[PDB]
RNA sequence: GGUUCGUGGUAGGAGAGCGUUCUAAGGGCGGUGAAGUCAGACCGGAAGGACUGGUGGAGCGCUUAGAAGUGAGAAUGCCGGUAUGAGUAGCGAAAGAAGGGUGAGAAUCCCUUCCACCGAAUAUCUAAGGUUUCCUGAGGAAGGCUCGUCCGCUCAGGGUU
RNA sequence: CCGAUAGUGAACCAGUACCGUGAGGGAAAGGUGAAAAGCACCCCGGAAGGGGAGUGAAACAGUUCCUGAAACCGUGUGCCU
RNA sequence: UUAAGUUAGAAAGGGCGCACGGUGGAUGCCUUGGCACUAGGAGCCGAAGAAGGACGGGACUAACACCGAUAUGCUUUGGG
């Protein structure tokens, strides 16, 4: 597995941040090395989603950030990233056995030449 | 006939500009532009404008065909150096050369 | 009146640099190494005008030695023979006969054998 | 620690024989009709070759 | 005018000269192109001198004599320029991420959210010291160890009761 | 007598800038053209910069702009490797 | 065809020569400034506030020069 120029806690923070962003926005632009780590971490969260159990919900809730995605309106209740992972995202991969992400190569970034990719669901 | 364009006194060390200008020398202008677009260097966008200026000059001043143009010449000449100082340890100041470049590109019909 | 250094220095150094034309790198560009290179080129040229005369006499002698051994003489016998015979043709000329008209050289080597 | 002699022009140039860039790995598109890096999305079309994105 | 004997050379003695700037006198060159500068395969025993062509765009040779800040390769010389080392060392303690925006251009500016750091401080005042760095608008040459649309930077206007 | 490294330290807003607690130390830096006639207009470019067009005897005189040596940096190629 | 032998050509880059550029500011030409003198004049200023300054004064004014709240000038006499 990749050390991403970070300590163990920083890296675990970075993978939690990127994972949540990928679940919330369904498409993010990041570096190639970051995108090749995320695909593992996000496809495991989507698997827990599809599981759907309380146990599975609590495994995902131990990793996914507590970000409000949107506020829907029923008395307007906010929807958290974790609810969007079990209510919206996972069930749309119910008959797909793995491979919920795809990395498109975009090109190098002006400031540091970093190879940039779009990583997206489906 | 052939069209010239020069970017005089560009802040960009000549060495750094030459390493890229070497890729386009003799290529077709279509290809040359693509090489500059996908060559991730600081020199690339600067050299692209000079090369695109050369092509505009070749299309507007000399009615040449922009679909039949090869980069005949492309060279980088040293411009005047900006002299700077970097304070080093023990009160000593070491020189810094902020170098400049004259980038010339010449396109020719074939 | 003040005399500034003007022109004479440049004119004198540029002549020397020109005499170093063809020399490797800095030796054809920079006055200081050009000047040494030119001094040394003249020294070699003076020495090699003497060495050239020695060099050619050794080349002629080798070729006469060859042409004479095809006649069953050595160079030392042939040159002794010619001295006794009275023939005063020098080595540059014999060497030329020994390459260009071997028939003539053989005639001289005949004269040599007769004197011995 | 320090250079004993200045490096000559010839020698400096020989050392730089290898300091150079490689041409980009690029080809023309079908849709765009323009150049692109293989295995990248073409931004002229705004997609991955002919496959729409 | 010829015979004879000579002609390696450091310190050093002796001699004859080359060239530079200036003066005088004489005689000249020069916008039909002076000096300088570049080039060349020419001339003299040397120092050196011409000629031709390019560049240059207004002064300069020659003769005889005179006078000297009169000739540079070395002084760890002085000053300037430019190399080499080298695309090398370094880029000065530290946690960022994505989305949205702005823009010719964005890792680096703005906003949002999450994350992380200080918390007898990395917070809040005040004195010294600095002296406009403060605010607003515009800018991105240089400065900022990268970038830059940003700034304690540049330019305007302001602002201290 | 000097002719911009000379001549004053100072031909130029110089005892300035800068250095120093201070006394004090102390620079660098002249030349568009006869005349601004200082490049309308078009073109690439965000600009810088450039290419045309034009002015001029000249712009390879283009607001630090007479000349423009050498080091040094490049491009091309006749011979060699 | 097999065998044996000989010889060519090549340039990643490099060298020499040449051509053309860049950089740089030597050189020549030039002079606004200096240097040394000669002849003549003059050799002092200050409580009637000096030397030397500071801050001000222009339609807009950062600097220099000039001027002092009468401030980028006032009066007068001559020149033009
Ligand atoms: Mg920990
Ligand atoms: Mg210190
Ligand atoms: Mg002998
Ligand atoms: Mg002798
Ligand atoms: Mg002798
Ligand atoms: Mg003269
Ligand atoms: Mg002298
Ligand atoms: Mg020297
Ligand atoms: Mg090294
Ligand atoms: Mg290393
Ligand atoms: Mg490093
Ligand atoms: Mg830092
Ligand atoms: Mg504590
Ligand atoms: Mg501020
Ligand atoms: Mg910068
Ligand atoms: Mg700003
Ligand atoms: Mg002076
Ligand atoms: Mg001068
Ligand atoms: Mg000039
Ligand atoms: Mg009157
Ligand atoms: Zn395409």
Swiss-Prot record, chain A:
PROSITE patterns to which the protein is assigned, alphabetical: RIBOSOMAL_L17 (PS01167)
Gene3D superfamilies referenced in this protein's UniProt entry, alphabetically: Ribosomal protein L17
Name of one Pfam family that matches: Ribosomal_L17
InterPro entries attached to this UniProt entry: Ribosomal_bL17, Ribosomal_bL17_CS, Ribosomal_bL17_sf
Protein's UniProt keywords contain Ribonucleoprotein: yes
GO biological process: translation
GO function terms (MF aspect): structural constituent of ribosome
GO cellular component: cytosolic large ribosomal subunit
UniProt keyword annotations, A-Z: Ribonucleoprotein, Ribosomal protein
Similarity comment: family membership: Belongs to the bacterial ribosomal protein bL17 family.
NCBIfam families: L17 (TIGR00059)
Subunit structure: Part of the 50S ribosomal subunit. Contacts protein L32.
Name of the protein in its database record: Large ribosomal subunit protein bL17
The encoding gene: rplQ
From Swiss-Prot, chain B:
InterPro entries attached to this UniProt entry: Ribosomal_uL22, Ribosomal_uL22_bac/chlpt-type, Ribosomal_uL22_bac/org-type, Ribosomal_uL22_CS, Ribosomal_uL22_sf
GO process terms (BP): translation
Disulfide bridges in this chain: none
SUPFAM superfamilies documented for this protein: Ribosomal protein L22
Gene Ontology annotations for the cellular component aspect, listed alphabetically: cytosolic large ribosomal subunit
Pfam families recorded: Ribosomal_L22
Keyword Ribonucleoprotein: yes
Keywords tagged on the record: Ribonucleoprotein, Ribosomal protein, RNA-binding, rRNA-binding
Gene3D superfamilies assigned to the protein according to its UniProt record, in alphabetical order: Ribosomal protein L22/L17 (3.90.470.10)
Molecular function terms, GO-annotated: rRNA binding; structural constituent of ribosome
Database matches in PROSITE patterns: RIBOSOMAL_L22 (PS00464)
Family membership: Belongs to the universal ribosomal protein uL22 family.
Function noted in UniProt: This protein binds specifically to 23S rRNA; its binding is stimulated by other ribosomal proteins, e.g. L4, L17, and L20. It is important during the early stages of 50S assembly. It makes multiple contacts with different domains of the 23S rRNA in the assembled 50S subunit and ribosome.
Self-association and partners: Part of the 50S ribosomal subunit.
Protein name: Large ribosomal subunit protein uL22
Species in which this protein is naturally found: Listeria monocytogenes serovar 1/2a (strain ATCC BAA-679 / EGD-e)
Organism ancestry: Bacteria, Bacillati, Bacillota, Bacilli, Bacillales
From Swiss-Prot, chain C:
Keywords: Ribonucleoprotein, Ribosomal protein, RNA-binding, rRNA-binding
InterPro entries noted in UniProt: Ribosomal_bL20, RIBOSOMAL_L20_CS, Ribosomal_protein_bL20_C
Pfam families: Ribosomal_L20 (PF00453)
Transmembrane segments: none
Keyword Magnesium: no
GO molecular function: rRNA binding; structural constituent of ribosome
Gene Ontology biological-process entries: ribosomal large subunit assembly; translation
GO cellular component, one term: cytosolic large ribosomal subunit
Domain of life of the native organism: Bacteria
Family that this chain belongs to: Belongs to the bacterial ribosomal protein bL20 family.
Protein task: Binds directly to 23S ribosomal RNA and is necessary for the in vitro assembly process of the 50S ribosomal subunit. It is not involved in the protein synthesizing functions of that subunit.
Stated name of the protein: Large ribosomal subunit protein bL20
Source species of the chain: Listeria monocytogenes serovar 1/2a (strain ATCC BAA-679 / EGD-e)
Lineage: Bacteria, Bacillati, Bacillota, Bacilli, Bacillales
Gene it is expressed from: rplT
UniProtKB/Swiss-Prot annotation, chain D:
Organism: Listeria monocytogenes serovar 1/2a (strain ATCC BAA-679 / EGD-e)
Gene: rpmF2
Sequence similarity: Belongs to the bacterial ribosomal protein bL32 family.
Domain of life of the organism encoding this protein: Bacteria
Name of protein: Large ribosomal subunit protein bL32B
Record key words, sorted: Ribonucleoprotein, Ribosomal protein
Molecular-function annotations in GO: structural constituent of ribosome
Matching NCBIfam families: rpmF_bact (TIGR01031)
The keyword GTP-binding is assigned to this record: no
Pfam family, one: Ribosomal_L32p
């Amino acid at each position: 597995y990749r050390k991403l120029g970070r300590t163990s806690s920083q890296r675990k923070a970075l993978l939690r941040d990127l994972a949540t962003d990928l679940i919330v926005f369904e498409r993010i632009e990041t570096t190639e090395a970051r995108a090749k780590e995320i695909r593992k971490v996000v496809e495991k969260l989507i698997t827990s989603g599809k599981k759907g159990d309380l146990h599975a919900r609590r495994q995902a809730a131990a990793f996914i950030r507590h970000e409000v995605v949107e506020v829907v309106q029923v008395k307007n209740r906010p929807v958290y990233a974790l609810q969007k992972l079990f209510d919206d995202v996972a069930p749309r991969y119910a008959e797909r056995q793995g491979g919920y992400t795809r990395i498109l190569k975009k090109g190098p970034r002006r400031g540091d030449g970093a190879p940039m990719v779009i990583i997206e669901l489906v | 006939t052939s069209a010239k364009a020069v970017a005089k006194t560009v802040r960009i060390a000549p060495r750094k500009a030459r390493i890229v200008i070497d890729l386009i020398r003799g290529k077709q202008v279509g290809e040359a532009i693509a090489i500059l677009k996908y060559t991730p260097r600081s020199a690339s966008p600067i050299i692209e404008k000079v090369l695109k200026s050369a092509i505009a000059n070749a299309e507007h001043n000399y009615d040449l065909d922009i679909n039949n143009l090869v980069v005949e010449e492309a060279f980088v000449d040293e411009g005047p150096t900006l002299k700077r100082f970097r304070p080093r340890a023990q009160g000593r100041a070491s020189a810094i050369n902020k170098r400049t470049s004259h980038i010339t590109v010449v396109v020719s019909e074939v | 009146p003040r005399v500034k250094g003007g022109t004479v220095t440049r004119k004198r150094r540029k002549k020397i640099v020109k005499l170093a034309k063809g020399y490797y790198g800095s030796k054809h560009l920079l006055f200081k190494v050009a000047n040494q290179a030119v001094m040394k080129s003249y020294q070699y040229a003076y020495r090699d005008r003497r060495q050239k005369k020695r060099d050619f006499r050794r080349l002629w002698i080798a070729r006469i030695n060859a042409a004479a051994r095809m006649q069953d003489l050595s160079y030392s016998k042939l040159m002794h023979g010619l001295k006794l015979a009275g023939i005063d043709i020098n080595r540059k000329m014999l060497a030329d006969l020994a390459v260009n008209d071997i028939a003539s050289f053989n005639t001289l080597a005949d004269s040599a054998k007769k004197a011995l | 620690a320090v250079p004993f002699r200045r490096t000559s022009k010839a020698k400096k140039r020989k050392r730089r024989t290898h300091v150079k860039l490689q041409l980009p790995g690029m080809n023309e598109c079908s849709n765009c009709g323009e150049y692109r890096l293989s295995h990248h999305v073409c931004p002229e079309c705004g997609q991955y070759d002919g496959k729409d994105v």
